[PDB]
Amino acid sequence: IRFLDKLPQRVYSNSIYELLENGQRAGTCVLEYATPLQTLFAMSQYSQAGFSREDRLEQAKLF
Amino acid sequence: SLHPSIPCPRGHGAQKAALVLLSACLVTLWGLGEPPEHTLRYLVLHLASLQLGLLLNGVCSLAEELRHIHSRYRGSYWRTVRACLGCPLRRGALLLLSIYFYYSLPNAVGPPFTWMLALLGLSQALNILLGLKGLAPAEISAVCEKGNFNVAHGLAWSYYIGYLRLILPELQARIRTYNQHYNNGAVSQRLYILLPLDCGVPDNLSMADPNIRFLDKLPQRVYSNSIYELLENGQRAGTCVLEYATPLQTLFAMSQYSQAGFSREDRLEQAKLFCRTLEDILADAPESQNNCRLIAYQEPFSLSQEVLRHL
Numbered sequence A: 001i002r003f004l005d006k007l008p009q010r011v012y013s014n015s016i017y018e019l020l021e022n023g024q025r026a027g028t029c030v031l032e033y034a035t036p037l038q039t040l041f042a043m044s045q046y047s048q049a050g051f052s053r054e055d056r057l058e059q060a061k062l063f
Numbered sequence B: 001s002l003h004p005s006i007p008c009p010r011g012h013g014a015q016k017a018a019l020v021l022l023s024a025c026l027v028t029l030w031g032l033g034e035p036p037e038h039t040l041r042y043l044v045l046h047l048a049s050l051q052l053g054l055l056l057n058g059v060c061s062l063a064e065e066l067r068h069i070h071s072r073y074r075g076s077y078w079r080t081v082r083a084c085l086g087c088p089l090r091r092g093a094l095l096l097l098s099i100y101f102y103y104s105l106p107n108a109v110g111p112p113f114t115w116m117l118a119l120l121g122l123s124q125a126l127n128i129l130l131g132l133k134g135l136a137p138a139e140i141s142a143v144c145e146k147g148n149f150n151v152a153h154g155l156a157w158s159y160y161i162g163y164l165r166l167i168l169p170e171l172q173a174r175i176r177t178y179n180q181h182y183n184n185g186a187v188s189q190r191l192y193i194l195l196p197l198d199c200g201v202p203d204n205l206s207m208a209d210p211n212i213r214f215l216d217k218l219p220q221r222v223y224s225n226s227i228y229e230l231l232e233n234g235q236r237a238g239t240c241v242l243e244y245a246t247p248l249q250t251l252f253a254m255s256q257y258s259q260a261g262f263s264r265e266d267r268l269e270q271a272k273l274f275c276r277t278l279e280d281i282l283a284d285a286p287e288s289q290n291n292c293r294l295i296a297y298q299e300p301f302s303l304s305q306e307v308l309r310h311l
């Protein structure tokens, strides 16, 4: 998965990524992560959450 | 040398022609072999008459320039005399030479002193009233350009001082930042200024030629510069920051109105002169460190091909 180009355009920048299959680009797509999962992880890191790793995985699946 | 139609700065052809004429006249005089002292007398008398006529014309000009002294010559008569008759001491010496030569050298073909003065005054009055001593447009343009008395020079310098010098130092950094943001192609780092000799500046650049198409607003008082990519046989081959020359648009608007006294041929002359003046300024300016180029053209053809060949 390698970055190719910032998709042209309230200002959303979606980096597109090409997919190397044995070194050859089988295609490309607009690919991105899910930020609520990152917020769940950061919730689990902090101590003012009461939100453990077991609960973090449970909430990730439920989300 | 931007365009085949842009005039070159005036050469020394007039002085070359004068030297050719002087050589021919010397050949003729040596062939005829007339008494040289008579020739000296005649030439000195002719120059004296011409100088005194110029003195009379300057006096006539001073007669009206005396009323502008408070607002144009800071209320000093010496400034008015200098502006109406050139350098005072040089012309006074020439006039004294004329008077002494005429009063010493007899005039074989010429009036006495009072008769010559009266005839010269009459001729000066006739030339003033009838406009016989008329200024040819070629010499008018030569003098205006030599002394920088053209609207195009002022417009070009205003365009430089107000806009170009402010944005060129940071245009390189802005283009580098944009190219780092949008990668893959890349955008040329040099500004491109359009210069249609016909002064046709459409609001939309793509309307003039579909091959040139807007790409993105370049990131940044507030300078909104639009970048354009050029279509070659349906596919883009290059891209650059391309904007129109607003002073040419102002020149066209000046030509549109009926109070500027600014005709279409005058608009063509000032367009060419603006192109040349901006060429010189951006050639010697420090801010134009190979940073700006002018696409000067005229439709009698595609602009995009010319911009590509520039790229």
Ligand SMILES: CCn1nc(C)cc1C(=O)Nc1nc2cc(C(N)=O)cc(OC)c2n1C/C=C/Cn1c(NC(=O)c2cc(C)nn2CC)nc2cc(C(N)=O)cc(OCCCN3CCOCC3)c21
Binding pocket: B155, B158, B159, B160, B161, B162, B163, B221, B222, B223, B224, B225, B246, B247, B250
């Ligand atoms: C001066 C150089 N020059 N000589 C000739 C001939 C043509 C130009 C030229 O092209 N100049 C120019 N073009 C710009 C384009 C952009 C952009 N965003 O793309 C940004 C710029 O800088 C802000 C631009 N500048 C410089 C500043 C320009 C205009 N302006 C002036 N008038 C002059 O300076 C002036 C002096 C003489 C003589 N003639 N003129 C103008 C005809 N007073 C201003 C006061 C304010 C304020 N603080 O309130 C804001 C200003 O600018 C906002 C206008 C932006 N409009 C401009 C037109 O198009 C659309 C965007 C002011």
Ligand SMILES: CC1(C)C(=O)N(Cc2c(F)cccc2Cl)c2cc(C(=O)NCc3c(F)cc(F)cc3F)ccc21
Binding pocket: B042, B043, B045, B046, B048, B049, B050, B107, B109, B110, B111, B116, B117, B119, B120, B121, B123
């Ligand atoms: C170059 C050459 C040979 C020449 O072609 N002329 C024209 C000309 C005349 F004008 C007059 C007669 C014969 C010729 Cl031939 C000329 C004139 C003088 C001269 O002293 N002119 C006095 C003078 C005027 F005559 C009229 C005037 F309004 C003011 C003035 F001061 C000297 C040399 C020449």
